[PDB]
């Protein structure tokens, strides 16, 4: 209804036109609520600027050089044993367990859980992972 770029609700109107002053209240106080923010901005620009000083370093010094170990389904007593222990640190997480061992596919790791499950009391290997 009002021409383009002109702003007027019986709300905004009735409020610049109660108390013979309450126009220069509303217009000349919002910019007080505006300055209060322009400072909160400043707080955080410093607060964050500080944390950005703590990250100069990156994590470049701490990156273990992750090599590809060409997968396998030869399930060594070596790897077999890591697996039980991994079950115990991890459970479910077929990925981590395979990430640990160095050759499965969550395929082959999902395969031990069940297949080798008979022989290594994996009941009591996951019953310790529900408690610690």
């Amino acid at each position: 209804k009002p021409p383009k770029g002109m702003f007027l609700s019986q709300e905004d109107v009735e409020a610049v036109s109660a108390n013979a002053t309450a126009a220069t209240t509303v217009l000349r106080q919002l910019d007080m609520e505006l300055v209060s923010v322009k400072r909160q901005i400043q707080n955080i620009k410093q607060t964050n600027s500080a944390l950005k000083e703590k990250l100069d370093g990156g994590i470049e010094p701490y990156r273990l050089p992750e090599v590809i170990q060409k997968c396998n389904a030869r399930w060594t007593t070596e790897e077999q044993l890591l697996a039980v222990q991994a079950i115990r640190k991890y459970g479910r997480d077929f990925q981590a367990i395979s990430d640990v061992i160095g050759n499965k596919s969550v395929v082959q790791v999902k395969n031990f859980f069940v297949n080798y499950r008979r022989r290594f009391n994996i009941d009591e290997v996951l019953q310790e992972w529900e408690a610690e």
Partner: protein
């Protein structure tokens, strides 16, 4: 249509009968539509004839000779039409050659107060109708607020210089009869701020758009949002502007508030993140040592400590996956803070260099309405806007006084005769005037009817310049309290040397305050000779009436020195100064629709007065006291045409009371 163009030019609708032809053709309009469509032809034709040449009287014979049948046929109703039109001043008004000379069978005495256009129009009309008319004018000349200056080859209207279009303007006709040279006026208005250097396009254009945007805004504010009474007082136009503007100065702010409050939602998100990222870099520095430590334990090894290296190596590559996501997701957030911190909501509503130019756009408004916007009714100030003429606004190049004067030829005008008292009663009226030159010399005019063109200004005067006996009824007087009589004034600067730009008609000057927006806010050349007019409007013009002549021609020259340079602008060969509110035969410039008035007041102002009965128990008399001029005519106030129309009108009205039959 062409015959319908005469209806338009006569301010009537070609396709329907008016509420007023109905008046006195209630037969035709009650009845069948064929008869109506014929009526209308005759009406419009008869007009077209008069118009197609208005410097000679159009008899009934002439109108019949020129109608082809089937309209030629109803010979009686063609008479009926020609007579309505003749009376009500739609034809055969202003200045003509009379084919039928004045019958000296004169019939009724009417005293008309004032030789203003309102007056002279009715006067000539009434005398055309056969009637003894005498005009009583306080001034030493005719025309009143049509006031033209002349010394040597210099000429300039000190009131009333525009023709607000010829499209349905009666003055169109008059200007044919008087052969007044009218000249158009060229759009271009260069504004010059307090310094003397022009405003540029860009800015100039910006503010007009804003001005206009701002007015429309008030109109919405009024008609739609209904902001028509802040605290049992009617609302000024000016008040609504102050409000509209203020809400534009709000918003502009809340715009900023919402933008910075959008930045913190960001900054504060990236903080909640920089924390996850610093604390990971902790879990990482550490976990890594542990994997250096357990990896140090060189092999062969038992499988619990092979598993220790194996497991810590996974867990460290987990966290570095994790922390790397967090620093994609970080520049994702320092991206958002370029976008926002880069282009912000707008700084301000209006520059103080702008709100200053905007003040000049308002001064222009205060000028044409001849009043402070403080005072204009919001609901009603523009009520005359549906009726504005077509055509370009023109200016009277040869001095507008030529018209009054023309009109006054052949009329009993008693000049310097200043009505002091108007008495009116059942049996007739007594008007008591005095001579202005000696106040003591007392005159008495007896008549059947008084027509009062006394200006609204004058009518308002307290204590009263003119006394009504008996007094005017509360309703009429109340109307006068209510309506607005406004004010403007003019400085007339006559030079030898055409120093402004010839191709430029008019150019503003921008005042430094709001309070001072009116002071010489505009300058106008329109005359063959080297004359510039300096116009004063608004709250200003009221005050500039006090400041001496030389002082005003001061600032006149000053702001011309600015706009043009001390080298270029002479002293002026001749000067003159409006000052209308002080002139006592005026008390101002023209009417306006004060807040709390409506257009209805203009109709109350026209309503004639009918006295009490002579001998109690007598029959209800006729009306004795009538009213014309620009304050009476709600569709055309504060104009020459409106005045002239009001006169045309009362004359018809008076005739119908005192000669009824044609």
């Amino acid at each position: 249509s062409g015959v319908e163009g005469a209806a338009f030019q006569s301010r009537l609708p070609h396709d329907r009968m008016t509420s007023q032809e109905a008046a006195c053709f209630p037969d035709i309009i009650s009845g069948p539509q064929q008869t109506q469509k014929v009526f209308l032809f005759i009406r419009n034709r008869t007009l077209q004839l008069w118009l197609d040449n208005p410097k000679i009287q159009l008899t009934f014979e002439a109108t019949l000779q020129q109608l082809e049948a089937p309209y030629n046929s109803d010979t009686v109703l063609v008479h009926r039409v020609h007579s309505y039109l003749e009376r009500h001043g739609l034809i055969n008004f202003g200045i003509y050659k009379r084919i039928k000379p004045l019958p000296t069978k004169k019939t009724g005495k009417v005293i008309i107060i004032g030789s203003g256009v309102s007056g002279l129009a009715a006067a000539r009309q009434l005398q055309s109708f056969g009637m003894d008319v005498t005009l009583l004018e306080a001034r030493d000349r005719v025309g009143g607020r049509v006031a033209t200056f002349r010394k040597g080859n210099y000429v300039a209207d000190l009131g009333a210089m525009v023709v607000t279009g010829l499209g349905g303007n009666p003055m169109a006709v008059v200007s044919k009869q008087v052969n007044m040279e009218l000249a158009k006026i060229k759009q271009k208005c260069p504004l010059y701020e307090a310094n003397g250097q022009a405003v540029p396009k860009e800015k100039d254009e910006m503010v007009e758009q804003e001005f206009n945007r701002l007015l429309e805004a008030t109109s919405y504010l009024s008609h739609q949002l209904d902001f028509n009474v802040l605290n049992n007082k009617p609302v000024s136009l000016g008040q609504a502007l102050e409000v509209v503007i203020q809400l534009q100065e709000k918003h502009v702010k809340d715009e900023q508030i919402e933008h910075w409050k959008k930045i913190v939602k960001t900054q504060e998100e990236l903080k909640e993140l920089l924390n996850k990222m610093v604390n990971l870099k902790e879990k990482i520095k550490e976990l890594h040592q542990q994997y250096k430590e357990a990896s140090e334990v060189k092999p062969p090894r038992d499988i619990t400590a092979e598993f220790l290296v194996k497991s810590k190596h996974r867990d460290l590559t987990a966290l570095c996956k994790e922390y790397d996501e967090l620093a994609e997701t970080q520049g994702k957030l320092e991206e958002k803070l370029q976008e926002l911190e880069a282009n912000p909501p707008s700084d301000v509503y209006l520059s103080s260099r702008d709100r200053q130019i905007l003040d000049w756009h308002f001064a222009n408004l205060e000028f044409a309405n001849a009043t402070p916007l403080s005072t204009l009714s919001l609901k009603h100030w523009d009520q005359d806007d549906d009726f504005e003429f077509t055509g370009s606004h023109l200016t009277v190049r040869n001095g507008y006084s030529c018209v009054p004067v023309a009109l006054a030829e052949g009329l009993d005008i008693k000049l310097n005769t200043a009505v002091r008292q108007v008495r009116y009663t059942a049996s007739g009226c007594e008007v008591i005037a005095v001579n202005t030159r000696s106040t003591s010399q007392t005159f008495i005019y007896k008549c059947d009817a008084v027509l009062c063109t006394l200006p609204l200004g004058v009518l308002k005067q307290q204590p009263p310049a003119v006394q009504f006996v008996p007094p005017l009824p509360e309703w009429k007087t109340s109307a006068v309290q209510r309506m607005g009589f406004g004010n403007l004034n003019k400085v007339v600067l006559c030079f030898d040397r055409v120093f402004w730009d010839p191709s430029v008609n008019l150019f503003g000057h921008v005042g430094s305050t709001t309070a001072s927006r009116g002071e010489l806010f505009l300058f106008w050349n329109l005359y063959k000779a080297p004359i510039l007019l300096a116009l004063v409007a608004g709250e200003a013009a009221g005050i500039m009436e006090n400041i001496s002549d030389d002082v005003i021609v001061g600032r006149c020259l000053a702001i011309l020195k600015g706009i043009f340079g001390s080298s270029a602008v002479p002293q002026p060969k001749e000067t003159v100064v409006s000052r209308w509110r002080a002139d006592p035969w005026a008390r101002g410039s023209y009417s306006y629709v004060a807040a709390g008035s409506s257009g209805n007041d203009y109709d109350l102002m026209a309503q004639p007065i009918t006295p009490g009965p002579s001998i109690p128990g007598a029959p209800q008399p006729i009306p004795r006291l009538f009213f014309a001029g620009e304050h009476t005519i709600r569709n055309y106030p504060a104009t020459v045409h409106g005045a002239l129309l009001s006169g045309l009108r009362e004359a018809g009205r008076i005739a119908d009371q005192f000669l009824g039959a044609m």
